[PDB]
Amino acid sequence: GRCGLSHQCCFDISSVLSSSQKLVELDLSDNALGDFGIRLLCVGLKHLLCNLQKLWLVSCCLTSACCQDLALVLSSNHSLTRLYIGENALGDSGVQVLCEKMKDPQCNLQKLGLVNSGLTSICCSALTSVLKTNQNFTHLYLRSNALGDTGLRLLCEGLLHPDCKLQMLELDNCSLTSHSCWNLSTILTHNHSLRKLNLGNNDLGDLCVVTLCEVLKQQGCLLQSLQLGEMYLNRETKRALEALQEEKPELTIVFEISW
Amino acid sequence: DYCKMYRRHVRSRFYSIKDLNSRYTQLQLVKEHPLKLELLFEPEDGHSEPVHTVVFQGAAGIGKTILARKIMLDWALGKLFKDKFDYLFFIHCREVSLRTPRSLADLIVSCWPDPNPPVCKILRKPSRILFLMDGFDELQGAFDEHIGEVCTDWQKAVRGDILLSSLIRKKLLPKASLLITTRPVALEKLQHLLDHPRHVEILGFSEAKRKEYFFKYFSNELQAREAFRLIQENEVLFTMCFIPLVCWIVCTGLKQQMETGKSLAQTSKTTTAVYVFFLSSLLQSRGLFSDYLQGLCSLAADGIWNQKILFEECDLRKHGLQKTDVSAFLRMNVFQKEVDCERFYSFSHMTFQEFFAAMYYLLERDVKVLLENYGKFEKGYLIFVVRFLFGLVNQERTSYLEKKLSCKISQQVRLELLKWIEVKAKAKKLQWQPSQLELFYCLYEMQEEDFVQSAMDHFPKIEINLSTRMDHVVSSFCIKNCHRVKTLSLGFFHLTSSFCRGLFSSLSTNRSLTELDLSDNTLGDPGMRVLCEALQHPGCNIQRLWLGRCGLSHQCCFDISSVLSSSQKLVELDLSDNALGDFGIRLLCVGLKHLLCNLQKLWLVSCCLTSACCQDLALVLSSNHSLTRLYIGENALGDSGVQVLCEKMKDPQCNLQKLGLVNSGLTSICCSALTSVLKTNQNFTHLYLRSNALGDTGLRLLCEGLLHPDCKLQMLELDNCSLTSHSCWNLSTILTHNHSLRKLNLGNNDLGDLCVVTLCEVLKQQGCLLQSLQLGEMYLNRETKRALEALQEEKPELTIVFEISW
């Protein structure tokens, strides 16, 4: 991670990923594995039978032009189930590939960190497809992404598929109308989809957290936690939020903004 | 060259309008953003570097076009006007409202063409052209004022659509200043449209210069004083005397009454009431006219219904009831045709037009589409329409009008309004939709007890912001008729003694149930004095009083002490961000202890006090037992109160659950006092040390305080410190020895990788804490993250660690 590294390692590590029967995770972080070395990586992964568990391509300066190969190796292998691609240089136009990674069950990809993407609508539509179809898809770490209200709306529409087991989820950056959060809370009430959630730099307004605290107040939607940061909202929101946890510890915590 | 002949044309246009030169009193221009028309357009680099435009606002119906005309004529005459500009063009959009694609339109009377190309040539170097466009509210069409699809040429000689040429000229490459006049109903179309503008509010008649206007309008002796003072003696009509349209309509409406005599202040309650009285006074000797009024009525409203505000010299009227009655109407309404100056007929300020629209539904369509279309931009905001509708639907006025006009009126509309009220009760988008203030206007204007009660039942909480005394009165009226309203938040935007006294004598009638907030509002010297006399009477009063960030000072202290003595309903009282410096904390504490009060919370957060009052806080805390939640949040105290801090809770049965703390000074002694309280005091659930210069020895002796078993201390926090990564180990081990707390936070604590490594090991083996733990802002290496992300899924006992960034 962050090591002085380049494309050359790719074939090498592919070779050892083939010949290794002991490695269970391998991290490639902040290292200039630009592209086509991701191809060498994926061919090394799929060609033999390897007991790989994690695979981190975080901040590796790749593009969508290798995501198809990532999907191929993900379909072929089943040992790999934890695939961070964290906020590298991809986004839209990989969206069809993003979906067809998990277009069927038995993919076995528990967590899937995501990227600073581009056009929200199509990628979040692929996310809805994976959420409604794929089993054991425990996390979806969309973070610092230009995702819109329509995007997250169709995301909760993806949550509308019941029996979809999706644990901890996150929507970091967005600008929504304060009914969308109401839809997600109500859909959690309808079915205990996830456990916690984060809202980061989301400009949501007082009424947003007001609806949030009411819906959690009456048989709370989520059951574990919720994290809110960096708002300058008025303080009767704080009074309502500080009230509700002591009567109901179901919402174990809301991350207090500053006070 | 061209300037002179048209500056005389505009002088001729605006001199004759009434005169109005010696008939004017200055109104108020205000820009708070928390005036002087001279040099209104400073582009100075304080906060207005690139700006080019201002929007005029104010109370409903100022005659605003009149003020535009006054500015126009003032420049035309000069009057010490340093000419920053070569032309100010008055656009009467009430006429430009047509759909016709028109080019630059500097001709109005269709005179010989202006030097339009050389006018375009005197553009590039001097930006001394300006267009005072007015009546933006009357841009008709299909309520389509979104972003322009197609731009226009800079020469402006192209006869493009004003939607596609003029609007984009405003939007991009304007090259000239801009001033637009309209009401705040539904303008955001043009403001989400990027302009980088300012806004200024216009305020009508204050008492003194309203008297000046009365003197200037009336003759100096015939009616200048006695009428003024007799309408002064009215408890109302001084609420509306602020509004200029009311003053202009009572000044013109009372010169017909000396022929009758002593009929001035009668039947004068509300805007609808005075409009009805004025219309009846004008139409007194007319009854014949029963059909003429209906014919004019059944056509006036279509000006905004079909959205053809212009009558085309009243050719639609030529179809509908054109007789000598039209000549009589024009003669008594001189400002109908003369404003157009060539052929055309219209109304004065469309307010009598909306009154006639209310008359329409009074006489005999469907109410469904109107209430659906409420406040839109197709039938014309419907604001004054529904205002007069509510004013009329009052049952006494219903009977009076059904007898006067020989007309049947439906009572279903009353229910429709009801339905509407529940709908706007359930409308969560109240920021970009009509507020609660005009609903209050309407319910006041319709004066029905049970109806106002039912309307208020749908609203458990009120959010308004007072600007007019009319706002104060309508708020008082509605609030004194509430039973299903819990919280009453009020926005004061400035005497106020009696206003708020009424506002909360309404709460004295709200004894059914109430809750109060007054935050981020500057209660003056008697602003403190309000709500004290209100809380000083028994009954059912506010359970929880809020005064946070309010303009407040030492004076309130004694006052609130008094009400804290005389109140048996308050359970919490907040004093936040308010300059209750010191010795007012003494007044607070003496008020608390002297009597028996059921106080629960007490927030002195960010009140600029010192340790010199903490002893008094401890005395009152020892005396009282009801108080158990005492925030002193990070105000200006610290060490040297430490002995007091301890001796607050030196014994049990103190009953102080939570105790927020302060940015303190010398750690050791204060945290020693904290150890004393932790080891001795029962039911001490929180200890919110935050943003404090607390040292490793400090927190070490704190965990030594935790060493006392059977000490019930819930959620705890240590925000800022620099510790060795064994101290955290001690706290975790002592939690393992005894389940002291539930969660903890570590904030800006620079702790090192080994710290969280020890943390995750000790929680890994039968975790110390049992609920949560919060960590923020570390740049630590990532195998710490792997260990922490691992442990929760195998053991959810530590339900969460706040992830730093990933």
Round to whole Å and give the CA distance between B273 and B399: 14
B772 to chain A, any CB pair closer than 8 A? The answer is yes
Residue with tokens 């001796």: B647
A108 to chain B, any CB pair closer than 8 A? The answer is no
Token pair recorded at residue B542: 């506010």
Residues of A in Cβ contact (< 8 Å) with B802: 227, 255
Read off φ and ψ for residue B773, nearest 5 degrees.
Answer: -165, 140
Residues of A in Cβ contact (< 8 Å) with B428: 178-179, 207, 211
- Considering only CB atoms, B428 lies closest to which of A207, A225, A234, namely A207
- In degrees to the nearest 10, what's the CA dihedral of B437, B438, B443, B446? 140
Strands B774-775 and B601-603: unpaired
**Are the Cβ atoms of B799 and A225 closer than 8 angstroms?**
yes
B802 CB-near residues (< 8 Å, 6+ apart): A227, A255, B745, B773, B774, B775, B776
- The answer to whether residues A27 and A57 touch, using CB atoms and an 8 Å cutoff, is no
B782 to chain A, any CB pair closer than 8 A? The answer is yes
| Sequence-separated contacts (24+) of A21-27 with Cβ below 8 Å | A21/A50, A21/A51, A22/A51, A23/A50, A23/A51, A23/A52, A24/A51, A24/A52, A24/A53, A24/A54, A25/A52, A25/A53, A25/A54, A25/A55, A25/A82, A26/A52, A26/A54, A26/A55, A26/A56, A27/A1, A27/A54, A27/A56
- Considering only CB atoms, B800 lies closest to which of A211, A234, A253, namely A253
**Paired residues of B131 in beta bridges:** B89, B178
Read off φ and ψ for residue B129, nearest 5 degrees.
Answer: -100, 135
- Considering only CB atoms, B800 lies closest to which of A196, A235, A259, namely A196
Residue with tokens 């209200």: A149
Residue with tokens 């802002």: B777
- The answer to whether residues B446 and B413 touch, using CB atoms and an 8 Å cutoff, is no
Residues of B in Cβ contact (< 8 Å) with A235: 519, 548, 576
Min Cα distance A148 → chain B (Å) is 18
Tell me the technique behind this structure: cryo-EM
Buried (b) or exposed (e) across A221-233, using 16+ Cβ within 10 A? bbebbbbbbebeb
Min Cα distance A196 → chain B (Å) is 10
A59 to chain B, any CB pair closer than 8 A? The answer is no
B435 to chain A, any CB pair closer than 8 A? The answer is no
Round to whole Å and give the CA distance between B723 and B702: 13
B635 to chain A, any CB pair closer than 8 A? The answer is no
Q: Centre a 10 Å sphere on the Cβ of residue B369 and count the other Cβ atoms it contains.
A: 10
B714 to chain A, any CB pair closer than 8 A? The answer is no
- Mark which residues 190-219 of A lie under 8 Å from B by CB: 196, 205, 207, 211
Closest CA to B360 of B417, B279, B287, B305: B305
Strands B28-30 and B198-203: antiparallel
B638 CB-near residues (< 8 Å, 6+ apart): B611, B662, B663, B664, B665, B666, B670
Sheet of A140-142, strand order: A140-142, A169-171, A198-199, A227-228
**Are the Cβ atoms of A255 and B774 closer than 8 angstroms?**
yes
Distances B401 to A29, B69, B217, B347, B802 between C-alpha atoms, Å: 82, 37, 32, 23, 68
Å resolution of this model?
4.2
- The answer to whether residues B580 and B552 touch, using CB atoms and an 8 Å cutoff, is yes
